[PDB]
Design a protein around this ligand. Structure first.
Ligand code: NA
Ligand code: NA
Ligand SMILES: [Zn+2]
Ligand SMILES: [Zn+2]
Lengths: 41, 84
């Protein structure tokens, strides 16, 4: 089956988890309002 | 610009260590400091602890034990703040 070949594509999978790092990062930033204190500098 | 930011959430029950909800540098660090200030989240400059938390504390987890005392000192600071 060509369905498996397209499903397995390492290249489609690498973009996909590139966009996840970005997406989970954004989910991180949207949780900042839940914080009680921000430590900096 | 500027280097490090760590956002903590104190535990749901009052007697457990706080967790990291966000950390970053330096654009990210800046953009956390910004959202925090925008949403009136108290922000303390404590450069040694910020670099440390940033190095060692895992997002979504309880801060590490090496850093409890220091993060408890940040909490006393948050209490000083609640009085003008
Ligand atoms: Na809270
Ligand atoms: Na883990
Ligand atoms: Zn979103
Ligand atoms: Zn969230």
């Amino acid at each position: 089956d060509e369905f498996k070949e397209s499903e397995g594509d390492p290249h489609v999978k690498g973009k996909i988890r590139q966009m996840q790092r970005a997406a989970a990062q954004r989910r991180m930033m949207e949780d900042v309002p839940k914080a009680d204190v921000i430590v900096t500098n | 610009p500027t280097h490090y930011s760590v956002a903590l959430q104190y535990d749901e029950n009052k007697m457990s260590a706080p967790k990291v909800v966000a950390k970053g540098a330096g654009l990210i660090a800046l953009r956390i400091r910004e959202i925090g200030a925008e949403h009136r989240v108290p922000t303390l400059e404590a450069p040694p602890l910020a670099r440390a938390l940033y190095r060692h504390a895992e997002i979504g987890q309880q801060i590490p034990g090496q850093l409890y005392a220091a993060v408890a000192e940040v909490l006393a600071w948050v209490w000083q703040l609640k009085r003008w």
